Design a protein around this ligand. Structure first.
Ligand SMILES: CC(=O)N[C@H]1[C@H]([C@H](O)[C@H](O)CO)O[C@@](O[C@H]2[C@@H](O)[C@@H](CO)O[C@@H](O[C@H]3[C@H](O)[C@@H](O)[C@H](SCC(=N)NCCCC[C@H](NC(C)=O)C(N)=O)O[C@@H]3CO)[C@@H]2O)(C(=O)O)C[C@@H]1O
Ligand SMILES: [Zn+2]
Ligand SMILES: [Zn+2]
Ligand SMILES: [Zn+2]
Lengths: 213, 218
């Protein structure tokens, strides 16, 4: 049926640069193409309908063009507030269909993370589990490595991590990694450390605490 | 123009879901209302529409299990879907073109999870500020929201009065099958004993509401 193909999946631009988003239809959809913006924890918002009509209240830097099978959304001078996923859709014929989305991120100067560590709360330890959290705050670019060490033993398989979407106010990422042990295992060791590798750091940085301090 | 949806929740595979969309600011006898869904980290999928005149059109891939109806006098539109599959897990939206050529107005979304697991409210633990969460004049503190199901949870700080510097991280699915997430905030390190910081957690599927004060430890 009508497949919509967006390209690229992701792109990275500096502030002030012109951004071009592409959407291709597998059949002629004439001008029945819309573009949507979606930010984290928000519903989609209409930007462009009828291929080229700017919707109410949308800034003039957003422009749509194209017809038949080739459609374009341009942002003439991209701003921090434009970090979002962008979706195209056709409403030419049933069933209406959408592309898979394009994620827009911004380039900025390298920024090293601040690294913080949190021992488990006493209330959690009463219940029989220990979560240890390492926080990497406000870094760029997104690539980072977190290595847990327990009494100098490199850990594998007992941690999970999550990264925020890029922040509109300063274009950085943050990352949280959680190391989970039983209370019984947690009580056996003294030193808990997370070691962070990032291109903004001359050498990997370690943050640690000692369970007996 | 406004579209308000019923709340998120868990439903069992092979069974049926119901979502209500209550509209205001326009009349259902003049505008059609559509349903669209978005599987968690993916694109949008159109499900169907009930037009102002009351006829319906459905996505042919789903039409055997999909039903859309409405009550004009109550400004309500209903989505019903049965023989649910695990891959029906999605954020479900009501939307309308209004007077435009695309989906100009959207509901707030209803997160529906298809699973045989249990609904479970979270435990909330402090991430206590310390010397090891300080960098000069800036300190970080937070709260760990652990062992809940299904998504989502809402986290605010000081009931929403504190928004600057907050990072709420995407949840991870633990090996137990329950979700865990953290929320952190950075503040002046000199403020740690002088200001009250409370994380507020709302897990709507369970009606769990927890306020956790986050204080420095000794
Ligand atoms: C304020 C007002 O004027 N209200 C109208 C509303 C209102 O406009 C809509 O609800 C939008 O908010 O519309 C009302 O009328 C509806 C109703 O009449 C239904 C009945 O099914 O049709 C609606 O029109 C839709 C068409 O059914 C649908 O086919 C098209 S697809 C887009 C298109 N124009 N394609 C052109 C070619 C079609 C594909 C082609 N197929 C062929 C040639 O057979 C192919 N080759 O594949 O979309 C239409 C909507 O955009 C109609 O809007 C209502 O809701 O009842 C009337 C009310 O007065
Ligand atoms: Zn044409
Ligand atoms: Zn051990
Ligand atoms: Zn930040």
């Amino acid at each position: 049926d009508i497949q919509m193909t967006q390209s690229p999946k992701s792109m990275s631009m500096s502030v002030g640069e012109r951004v071009t988003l592409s959407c291709k239809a597998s059949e002629n959809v004439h001008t029945y193409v819309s573009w949507y913006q979606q930010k984290p924890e928000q519903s989609p918002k209409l930007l462009i309908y009828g291929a080229s009509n700017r919707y109410t209240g949308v800034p003039d830097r957003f422009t749509g063009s194209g017809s038949a099978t080739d459609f374009t959304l341009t942002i003439s001078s991209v701003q921090a507030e434009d970090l979002a996923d962008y979706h195209c859709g056709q409403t030419y014929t049933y069933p209406f269909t959408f592309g898979s989305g394009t994620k827009l991120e911004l380039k900025r100067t390298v920024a090293a993370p601040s690294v913080f560590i949190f021992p488990p709360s006493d209330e959690q330890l009463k219940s029989g589990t220990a979560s240890v959290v390492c926080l990497l705050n406000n870094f760029y670019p997104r690539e980072a490595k977190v290595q847990w060490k327990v009494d100098n033993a490199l850990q594998s398989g007992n941690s999970q991590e999550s990264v925020t979407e890029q922040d509109s106010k300063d274009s950085t990422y943050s990352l949280s990694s959680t190391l989970t042990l039983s209370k019984a295992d947690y009580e056996k060791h003294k030193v808990y450390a997370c070691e962070v590798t990032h291109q903004g750091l001359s050498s990997p940085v370690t943050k640690s605490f000692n369970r007996g301090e | 123009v406004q579209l308000k949806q019923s709340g998120p929740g868990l439903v069992a595979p092979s069974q049926s879901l119901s979502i209500t969309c209550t509209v205001s600011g326009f009349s259902l006898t003049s505008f059609g209302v559509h349903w669209v869904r978005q599987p968690p980290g993916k694109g949008l999928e159109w499900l169907g529409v009930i037009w102002a005149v009351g006829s319906t059109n459905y996505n042919s891939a789903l039409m055997s299990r999909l039903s859309i109806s409405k009550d004009n006098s109550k400004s309500q539109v209903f989505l019903k879907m049965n023989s649910l599959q695990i891959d029906d897990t999605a954020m479900y939206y009501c939307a309308t073109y209004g007077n435009y050529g695309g989906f100009a107005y959207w509901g707030q979304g209803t997160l529906v999870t298809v699973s045989s697991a249990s609904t479970k409210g979270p435990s909330v633990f402090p991430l206590a500020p310390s010397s090891k969460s300080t960098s000069g004049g800036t300190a970080a503190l937070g709260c760990l929201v652990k062992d809940y199901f299904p998504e989502p949870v809402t986290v605010s700080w000081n009931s929403g009065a504190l928004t600057s510097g907050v990072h709420t991280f995407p949840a991870v699915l633990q090996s137990s099958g329950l979700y865990s997430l953290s929320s952190v905030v950075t503040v002046p390190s000199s403020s740690l004993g002088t200001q009250t910081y409370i994380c507020n957690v709302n897990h709507k599927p369970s009606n769990t509401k927890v306020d956790k004060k986050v204080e420095p430890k000794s």
